[model samples]
Structures are given as structure tokens and as C-alpha cells.
Target: GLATILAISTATPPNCVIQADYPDYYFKITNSEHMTELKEKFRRLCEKSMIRKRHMCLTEEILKANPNMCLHMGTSLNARQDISLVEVPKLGKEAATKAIKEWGQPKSKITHLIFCTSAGVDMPGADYQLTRLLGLSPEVKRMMIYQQGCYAGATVLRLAKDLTENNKGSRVLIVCSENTVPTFRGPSDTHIDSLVGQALFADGAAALIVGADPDASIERPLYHIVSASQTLLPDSDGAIEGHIREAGLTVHLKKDVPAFFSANIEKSLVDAFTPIGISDWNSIFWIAHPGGPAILDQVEEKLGLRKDKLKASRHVMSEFGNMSSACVLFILDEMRKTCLEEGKATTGEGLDWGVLFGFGPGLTVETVVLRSVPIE
Candidate 1:
């Protein structure tokens, strides 16, 4: 009766901006008095952000043509640049193709396709574009989850579980992609909120395949969705949001986000696990979306988890910045590889457990509990 995660994969654009280079990039576009005084602060924030580099759709030519192009300074209100619109679908297609290839299932056989994104928009959308690019059957059902912010990754997976469980024999492909380049505001817009957004967000794509396949196991591990839950913190809706301004999609994240997360995450975890009869936190592996270093720190402190428990989340944040909704899948993929590499063997007595979760604009928290079934 459970949906099985067959495989997962991720992709990022070739051009990555190093965290160290961000200050120089910021200086190129702004001569503001605030920028001069805040330059060092910005540098320190990036350093403390725990992000080393982040992928983006911007190319060398694009940067050369416009020296002041900060990812935070999105395109002009009326101009509404096409760069992200074009690149999002392309990157999504590539990531989806890779996941399907690894899944080893015929494109025509995939029963459903669910796509999530908060960073880009298009007429046909990435979901439609991928169906064509991957040659999936025209009859394949699809749903596109947009503007849900970083938590949409888990949202889609929760939906995938429903589809596979209800439809029977269903194989659902979930893809999440974000291109932050076009969402950049101008250098003149130098609020601390804007700066944090610039420092933390980046571009990336990830895909996951979930099916009703019963033969799946943790070695050739097929992850079974054990339990899932979500929460919208009261009065916290304004803490995180995205809206379309003349400068394209603009994101606002409050400084208190970590504090808010810390306060509510434990309750969310209990709500997610209690239904499934799980209580001992020590028995589970944790895969969390690293909204930023502070978010991870807050969760770690609140949950009293092991120091190394959220390493994959931190690792992805350091290497890839925050890929928004696509990030949780990337973290999950990293968890899979790390588990296999560490030789975390399993047996019939019980399977290794993992709790996957993410956050988004509603100040929403989504959690999914997965059990790793051993091969043989």
C-alpha cells in the first residue's frame, strides 16, 4: 500500500558563483553609501552562510555584458527577462531525463509527472516542456506546484505517495527546478532582507521516481514512505513570502525564520511520526532542507540531534547554496549515497529509518518518514 522511491538525481547549471566573489560582484553594480559601510558585513554574512558556491543560469557573457548583475537584483518590472523562463525548463528536462534513465522505466509508462518550482514561470511551464522533451505519453497525468517556496519538494513527494497508493501500479516522476537569476532585484534595492536572499538562494534541479514496485529494497534501495505531515505556524505567514513586483519575482525572508523554525519543528516532527507509531528519535536518520546555516543550527539545537545527523543537508548547502524546492531532493540523494558508501547495512528484523523534511513560504514545514528496506 506504500509508495516506493525508486531513484533520485540532481543537476545544476555549469556556471557557479563562488561565495568569496560575491562582494566584488556587489561592488560592480552599486555605488550606494550603504553598500560601502555594509560591504564587510555582507562578506561576513556570506562566509557565515556556510555556502561556498552556487549554480546559476547566468553565463560569462551575461556577466560581462552587465557587470552589475546581482542575483538579488532581478530583471526590470516591465522587461521580465526570458533567461530563467528558458533555462528552467531546460535544466528540469535534463534532471528529469537523468532520473528516468536511472529508473530504467519506459517514458510512456510513467503514470504521473509532478513538478515544483518557485523561481521561474513559463506559458507551457516545465511540466509540459518535460513531457515533450522526455517523450512521455501524452496521456501521462501531470500537476505543477508553483510559488510554494522551498518546501514544495516534500509537497510533491507527499502527492506522489497518494497517486501511487490510490492508482496502483502508478509510477510518479517528481521534478523541482529553480533559476534565481531572473528574480534578482537591482543594486539600488539594498535592504538587509534582499541581501540575505541574494546570499542564500541559487539555481538547481532535482528529480525523484516513486512507484508501486514491491521488489524495491534499500540496497538497490526503494524507499517506502512511512508517514508524512505538515504545519503552518500561526501568525508566521509573513515570515517568508514571494511576490511578483515590477522587478520580477521577489522573495522576502525574515531574520526570525530560524527562531520560528526552532520553536515549531519538534511539534511538527511529533505530529508526523506519532501517527505511524514512531517515538525514539535515535532510531532514525534525519534529512532536512538546509534553508541556511542558521536554520539547520536551530533545528539541530531544538531536536537535540546528533552533530553528524544533518551533515548531508549542511553539505549540500555549503556546496550548492539553497536550491529552493529542489534542495530537499538533493539532500535526499546525498543521504542515499552516503548511506551506501558508509556501508550502513540492514536486515529483515527492521529497516533503517529516515525522516525527510523542508520549509517554505507559509512558514510551512513538511515532513516525510521513509524506511530503508534492505536488499536480499
Candidate 2:
């Protein structure tokens, strides 16, 4: 039997509207006495490799290419001054602790910790790091899921639902985090496909708590974990790929991604909802991964969804780009933000159902359905 959905609690979204700030110190790779030597080497490599143009790190190009870096740096320096003062360990400590604190408040009785991420893995990662930093109970079961890529948000929710469904009173906490800067690399006049990541990815973390109770408002409150489905493109192996090297992880993506979604996602969406008697597009609020403008446009066209139907998704993309697995949770966080404000309204009505979807490296799409709890 399906378990009752009790509540969904999401953290506040960090200000995603700003760009990342790149300090002169970060250009150590090419900003030294060897600047001319590196440029010549880059030029020769471009010619030898049959590439059209050489790489250049112009101030204008850096500012234009990495909006998230610029914006995040500015925000961190101003309001989050402590971040600018720290070393890498302190930065991670601050971000993990802050996210855990926000995620902890609404999950007072959580018994399980599930951390989802594909970015920067330290010794303890987020699970142990966050739990210790936030002073969560040592008795709480801890699980760290890594390398699942963008689809992880839905993946974690599915696991939480399954665990709660079997164990009646279980409480689960899901967290996602990503920092794309350590992975940033793009050549000047590169392929249009390669630049997609530049314009589309950002950094952020999100957390959610799920549980069931006798006093719960709805037999099913948070979007019911309806059926979830995953689809991977056959032999489309190169469509998305992540590799780790000396510098960091590099994401390789093909330009045909939009076309791939246009061709296949509609059928998957129908397959996911058809058996549940949800054939109408407007029946469920969409919480899609803001892969990029092209991917979003393709999804809209494929599903015949209205333009504004994906406003939250688009807002996230414009502001944050793709934050790997963390992006979907950020969207959910924003939606919850809206709900909290509306719940405070003098008159608000029935609950709403939401569907979240994200695309990953296998050229895969993962979907999860949820219901929103309305104010009484």
C-alpha cells in the first residue's frame, strides 16, 4: 500500500540572481610571467588540433561567461564576508553547516540522513560533515549517495518515499550540493555545445525533510510519491559525460540534447502519468531541471506545456544555471518559498500536485510526483 504523504519542508534558496566574482588571484594559471608562453602554447595547440581559434582569458569574456561565479563572489564578499576570509576547508564548513541548520529546523524528528551530490567529495562529504556541523544526532542513520549526477534530486525523493512507506513513522532528510567553479574550463570560440555548460551551470545546495504522522493534515500532503520513471537514450553515450582529472571534474555535453528531449521526453512524460489518469498537461505543476534555455524550450514544446508553466524553472536557470543535482531542489525550494507566503494569506484553498524531472549524464530523465499542502 502507498504510504500517506505528511509534509514537505524545503530550505530557503540562496540569492541565485547574482553572478560569480573571479578574483585576479584565481587566474594564476595564466596571469604570471609565463602569460606570453602559455598563450603561444595555447595558440599552437589550437592550430595543431584543427581548432578554429585559440583560447584567451579576457576580462570581458570571463565576466560574460561565468555569471554565477561573479555574482556569488559579490554576494559572499558583501553579506557573507566570512566566506571571503576563509580557506577552502572553512568555505565548505560554512556552506555545509548553514545548509544543515536550515534543513534541520523543519525536521526535528528526522531519523535518516540522505545526502545526494556528484560534486567535490571530501573525506566525510556532506552527510558526516553536515551532521557534525549541525549537531544532528549520532543515532540518525547516515547514507551518502555520490556520482548520480543531475537526476539525484528525484532519486533521493524516491528513496525517501520508499523508506517511509515501508517503515510507517520514518523521517528522512535529503540534501544536494554543488560547486561548479572548480570544474570550470572553456576555450575562446569553442564549440557552441561546449559553451552550453558555461551559460547553464551554477552552484548551490538544498535540503528537504519528509515524514508521516497520525496528526498529519493530509492522508497525502506533500506531493504523493506517485509513480516515478527513468529513461536513458540508447547508445547516445556522448550526450552527457563527467570526468575527473588533475584540475577537477569536467562535464562534456553534446549540442543535440535539445533535439533529444524534443524527440523522447514527451513519450516518457505520458508513460509516467497515463496509468495514474493524469493525461492533461495542466493537471500537475512542473518542477523541471533548468538544464538550459534550449532544454527548457524543448520540454515545453514536447509536452505542449504553456510557456509560463515553467516560470520557476526558467527563473532558476536565468539566475543559477545548472547546479548539477542541487538545481532541482533549488527549484523546489523556490516553489516552497511561494507556498509559504501564500499560506500566510487570509484566504487560500486546496492543495496542489507537483511533478519534478531532471536530466542526467546517461541522457536519462528521472521523474517524481508530489502534492503541496495547503493552509487550513
Candidate 3:
């Protein structure tokens, strides 16, 4: 039962920043005055809380921590950028090809590629494109996960964990990417709740290389997949829903998501660890998906986490918005830096412990427990 999870080569496209531009004729027919006011208002808000400002903060934190930082996009703007505009296909096949080349062929007995994304969906999405572009082994197996919403990253990891546990010697590649620009609907007063998306979501990508048996010397080792569980709240199917239409992917969000999470996820979290003898919150490094301010606040309050305990998650959300599946990996990336800088973990001492959890449609939450491997 030897297993390990490591971040081998991780990359993100330039964080897309949205900016108001010349108007289309549609505004002339659909309340031109209101549209003008809305654009002005949004411009003011962005000027004050610029997405680039948050990105700069994130970049500075990563650099300060001495973690590997790669700005995948070349755009001068921050909050107004599109992820696809900067990454592979847009950033061009070169970067994607490079990442795949570096990843090389899967070494485990069974190779599984799980692509998690919420922002962009082409005819042949990230998984298919990467497989062909990177020239993966002919025997490589693949699965595509979509519409799982902001929590898809954790869900995919849980899926990979299950496959690895059931079948020995499994190598799974988990990739997540989000492009907020294409789906940018702009801010709206009609939907106050949905407006959160404008302030909260950003563009990014993350890839994790995990295996039942992973080489220790070659990667930034994190935690091992120990135990995991998934829970779906009853009657909550409509709470968070996404659709693919002619106009692109439209996410139908029921505004009460925070309330739903506050009421449900705590119990699920408790149940997730009850069998593992983790009844206390102090013993675990809770890698909660960076859903949003309201959701994260609820988690901290319900779980009784100490003040500043969820700083890593908050920082990630503030900087990156909610990059669907990539959000968790970004948090994990930050945690890796924290562990190294604080001396909380040595190479492989198993010092870091606790649950990594994500919530999505089904209004569900997926959780996994992990411990750091002994440094070689």
C-alpha cells in the first residue's frame, strides 16, 4: 500500500483581468443608459479593488516564500485577463507541450488522466487536447470531468484517490484550469448574489502528479492520499448548477450557497473524520476549497478554526477568485511554501496532517485525509 502525491510541474496561464471596452449595438436596444451606468460603476469598483493588485500580492507572497512562481500570461492587465488567452492553445501548444514533455510517460502500472475545469470547455477540452498535444503513451487512459463547478479540483482528486486505492500502482494526472473572461457577464444589480462572481473569480491552472508509488527526490512532496469521503446535500441539486449553451457555459448559482454550506458542510466534515479519530479541529491542516469569502468564513466559524487559521485559503481566493478545481492546488502550493518557511515540515517527516475537502453541485463535499511522507 505504498502511495504518494507530489506536485511535479505546475503552471497557470496569465490571470485574466476584465476591462470595459467599446460597446456593442445591443446596448442601444437594451437600456443604454443603465448599461453605461453599470460599466462606470464597475470601472470604479475595479479601480479600487483591482484584480492585478491581488495578483501582485499573490506573486509577492510566492516569491517571498521562495516557491517556484511562473506568470503564464503576458498581459499587462490582471483582473481583466482570460486564462485561455495566455495558456496552451492560446499561450499556444508550446507551453502545454512543454509541460506534457516534462511530465513524460506515466510510470505506474495504471495511468489515469483526470482533467477538472469549470471556466473553459472547447469541443475537445483540456484532457483530450493535452493527451494528443503532449503525445502521451498510446496505452494512457483518460476521463473528462466537467460542470462540477468551483469544487471540481477536490472532487477529481478524490476520484483519482479512489482509483489508486482500488488498483495498485496507479499514476493519475490531475489538471484544473479556469478562464473567467469568456463567461464574464459583467456586474449586475438585478442579481446581487451573482455579482460575487465578478469580484471573486479569476483565471488559473494547476496540475498534480500523483501515484501509488512516487519518486521522492524529484518533486515537491505534499501529503499522501489516506482516506476520503463524498457527501451530497439533499434537495440541493439546483443550488449550484452550470449549463453549456450556444453562448458559452452559464453557471446558475442559487444565492443561498453560503447558508447551505454553513448549515451542511460542518456536519459532513465531522462525519468525514469521525471514523479516523479526528474529532478535534486542532490536529488537522484543513485544506478547504477556496470557494469565497462567505463560504470560507462559515467554514472557519463552524469548524472552530482559530483566527488566521484559514489565511492561506483567504489569500488564494482574494488573489485568484475561485478557479474551480485549480483553487485547492493553489492553496496546496501556498501551504507547501508555508511548511518550508516555518519549518513545520522537513523533507518527508509526515508533519503535516488533516483533511482536504471540496464542495460542489449535489451541493456536495468531498474530503480526503493525508500525511506528509518521510523526506528521503
Worst ten in a row by lDDT for model 3: 67-76
Best by TM-score: 1
Better of 1 and 2 by lDDT: 1
11-115, model 2: which lDDT tens digit per residue? 322333222222122233223324445444444432222111111122344445444333311221121211211222233344445444543434346688787
In candidate 1, which residue ranges exceed 4 Å CA deviation?
Answer: 29-34, 63-81, 188-190, 215-220, 346-351
Model 2, CA-based lDDT = 0.56
Where is the poorest 10-residue window by lDDT in model 1? 342-351
**lDDT ranking from best candidate downward:** 1, 3, 2
Our model 3 lands, by Cα RMSD against the true structure, at: 8.6
TM-score of each: 0.91, 0.72, 0.75
RMSD of each: 2.9, 9.0, 8.6
What local lDDT score does residue 336 receive in model 1, on the 0 to 100 scale? 70
Model 2 error, position 54 (Å) = 27
Which of the two, 1 or 3, has more TM-score?
1
CA lDDT of every candidate: 0.77, 0.56, 0.58
